[PDB]
Structure 1
């Protein structure tokens, strides 16, 4: 399929990644840079993010979803359903509203595309209605992360996809902070794109610290595999 081919040819080996985020949550401004690499053959991403404005005013775990579904491993039987690669290299726009239960919300807009050989995720994040002393602005979320399926459906009217899902972040007192994600992706280009049957992506995410890093940062290892169409 010369359409499946054009995506295979962009993602087959290890692809360098750059992430840039401009943030404003309740007027706490911040910027984050990330660098790393993905190997979609293995559904594998390795990234390190640095708060370049100083202290991150929110918990790192709250940013993990915002900080590359083109790096999903799509099994051979499901290649016709890989919207994310099909949009490249022109890329796509990824928009979210994430609702933190009993607290504020994030609205994100990102553009995911190639700049040369480098896959780039440029993001703007605005958070509003947070409790200065809640789980988020009060930094009461544990530095860990649970596995989660993410359900993708076509959005035929918008030539794109919609993704709906819940993340539960562990709170330090043993409870959980729900973060209900609503998501829409649309290709940046005018060309044809693969619009998928309903399926899901399985995520596992592991958060760590670089022992030689003094700046405020997050090391993120993700494995992501499409499934749900036998």
Structure 2
């Protein structure tokens, strides 16, 4: 696609999130860059309102699948890049098993030379001392496959996966993600055959940073198609 050409090098990224979980309001700003050639992202996020009222790992998926590496033999299946520069809307509901849910809406588009992800998040029905509001999730992250299908009637894609968040007591908290992406612009996009994205995420801290924050490094690679 034409949008693909915008990703051949290193692209600066900005992330902005306005959040409300059980009435606790908060904001996060992020910045970094993406190198889709290697399917690699580097981002740092800061809670600018003080302490983040939910665990950092619960927000990883919310904080730019246009940086996925699509191998050459799968390049006609890259919806994300095909929607650029005008972008796409990404909406999710994330159901935390035996707990509350997040609902998110984001616009992912170029603003000048920068890929910008602007999100609104609303979380409801969380348990005051469940794993989320009780901060019981470990500061780590597992590898996942993100399943993608075309949604022709909406000129976009439907996406589903289930994050496994390790809890401090040895158990796992699941977070079931129902996701849709739809183009912002009117130009044609690539609607894919079924496939998946293999995703790895490394969370760390900036030793020079005193605010509540998260450093993220991600690798994302499309797979599953040989026709």
TM-score (norm. length: structure 2): 0.99
Q: 1:159 & 1:6 partners in 2: Cα distance?
A: 17
Listed one character per residue, the Cα deviations across residues 59-106 of structure 1 (whole Å, up to 9, x for unaligned) are 000000000000000000001000000000000000000000000000
Listed one character per residue, the Cα deviations across residues 126-157 of structure 1 (whole Å, up to 9, x for unaligned) are 00000011100000000000000000000001
Equivalences for residues 70-219 of structure 1 within 5 A: 70-219=66-215
Across the aligned residues of Structure 1 and Structure 2, the Cα RMSD in angstroms comes to 0.5
Q: 2:222 & 2:25 partners in 1: Cα distance?
A: 35
Q: 1:7 & 1:159 partners in 2: Cα distance?
A: 16
Offset, 1:124: 0.2
Q: 1:28 & 1:141 partners in 2: Cα distance?
A: 18
Offset, 1:8: 3.0
Q: 1:157 & 1:196 partners in 2: Cα distance?
A: 13
Unaligned runs of 5+ in 2: none
Offset, 1:198: 0.1
Structure 1 runs of 4+ with >3 Å offset:
none
SS of the aligned residue for 1:113 comes to: strand
Offset, 1:6: 1.5
SS of the aligned residue for 2:208 comes to: coil
In 1, are the aligned partners of 2:4 and 2:82 still within 8 Å (CA)?
no
Offset, 1:7: 2.4
User: Number of residues paired by the alignment?
Assistant: 226
Listed one character per residue, the Cα deviations across residues 26-77 of structure 1 (whole Å, up to 9, x for unaligned) are 0000000000000000000000000000000000000000000000000000
Offset, 1:210: 0.1
Q: 1:68 & 1:119 partners in 2: Cα distance?
A: 9
Q: 2:8 & 2:31 partners in 1: Cα distance?
A: 19
SS of the aligned residue for 1:114 comes to: strand
Offset, 1:218: 0.2
Unaligned runs of 5+ in 1: none
Q: 1:22 & 1:132 partners in 2: Cα distance?
A: 21
TM-score (norm. length: structure 1): 0.98
Q: 1:166 & 1:140 partners in 2: Cα distance?
A: 18
Offset, 1:9: 1.8
